[PDB]
Design an enzyme around this catalytic site. Structure first.
Site, PDB file in Angstrom:
ATOM      1  N   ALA A 185      36.526  30.831  42.084  1.00 35.09           N
ATOM      2  CA  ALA A 185      36.417  32.243  42.972  1.00 35.09           C
ATOM      3  C   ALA A 185      36.732  33.284  42.364  1.00 35.09           C
ATOM      4  O   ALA A 185      37.503  33.484  41.125  1.00 35.09           O
ATOM      5  CB  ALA A 185      37.619  31.958  44.017  1.00 35.09           C
ATOM      6  N   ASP A 186      36.227  34.494  42.949  1.00 34.59           N
ATOM      7  CA  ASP A 186      36.464  35.717  42.419  1.00 34.59           C
ATOM      8  C   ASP A 186      37.498  36.496  43.695  1.00 34.59           C
ATOM      9  O   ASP A 186      37.579  35.845  44.652  1.00 34.59           O
ATOM     10  CB  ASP A 186      35.469  36.739  42.023  1.00 34.59           C
ATOM     11  CG  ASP A 186      34.598  37.001  43.235  1.00 34.59           C
ATOM     12  OD1 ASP A 186      34.976  37.151  44.253  1.00 34.59           O
ATOM     13  OD2 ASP A 186      33.278  37.010  42.921  1.00 34.59           O
ATOM     14  N   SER A 187      38.335  37.442  43.455  1.00 34.37           N
ATOM     15  CA  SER A 187      39.226  37.937  44.301  1.00 34.37           C
ATOM     16  C   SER A 187      38.617  38.348  45.794  1.00 34.37           C
ATOM     17  O   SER A 187      39.286  37.914  46.773  1.00 34.37           O
ATOM     18  CB  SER A 187      39.720  39.209  43.772  1.00 34.37           C
ATOM     19  OG  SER A 187      38.792  40.378  43.433  1.00 34.37           O
ATOM     20  N   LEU A 188      37.165  38.251  45.770  1.00 31.46           N
ATOM     21  CA  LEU A 188      36.598  38.603  46.926  1.00 31.46           C
ATOM     22  C   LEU A 188      36.294  37.408  47.724  1.00 31.46           C
ATOM     23  O   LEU A 188      36.355  37.299  48.996  1.00 31.46           O
ATOM     24  CB  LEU A 188      35.291  39.385  46.751  1.00 31.46           C
ATOM     25  CG  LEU A 188      35.679  40.988  46.616  1.00 31.46           C
ATOM     26  CD1 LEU A 188      34.322  41.569  45.734  1.00 31.46           C
ATOM     27  CD2 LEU A 188      35.830  41.835  48.023  1.00 31.46           C
ATOM     28  N   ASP A 189      35.954  36.449  47.008  1.00 28.09           N
ATOM     29  CA  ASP A 189      35.907  35.118  47.576  1.00 28.09           C
ATOM     30  C   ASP A 189      37.136  34.437  48.428  1.00 28.09           C
ATOM     31  O   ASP A 189      37.006  33.949  49.412  1.00 28.09           O
ATOM     32  CB  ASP A 189      35.463  33.922  46.445  1.00 28.09           C
ATOM     33  CG  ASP A 189      33.929  33.998  46.153  1.00 28.09           C
ATOM     34  OD1 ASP A 189      33.655  33.403  45.149  1.00 28.09           O
ATOM     35  OD2 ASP A 189      33.181  34.663  46.645  1.00 28.09           O
TER      36      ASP A 189
END
Length: 74
Positions: free
Chosen positions: A33-37
């Protein structure tokens, strides 16, 4: 069960296999994941379980155990 439920939301949101989604598993490092995910994931969970996650708490959430232990404690 609340685990299988949340694990399901996690696996479908982050497009990974259920077996990956373990209490020990990290959204970023382990699940890709990335922070926005995680922001999207959290909002889908608040939706699903009709419970608000204050920001102080949302930022503390590193792994799938953190998220589970919150929902069920609230």
């Amino acid at each position: 069960a609340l685990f299988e439920d949340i694990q399901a939301v996690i696996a479908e949101q982050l497009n990974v296999d259920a077996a990956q989604v373990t209490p020990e598993a990290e959204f970023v490092k382990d699940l890709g994941a990335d922070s926005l995910d995680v922001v999207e994931l959290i909002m889908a969970l608040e939706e699903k379980f009709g419970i608000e996650i204050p920001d102080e708490q949302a930022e503390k959430i590193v792994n799938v155990g953190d998220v589970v232990k919150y929902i069920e404690d609230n």
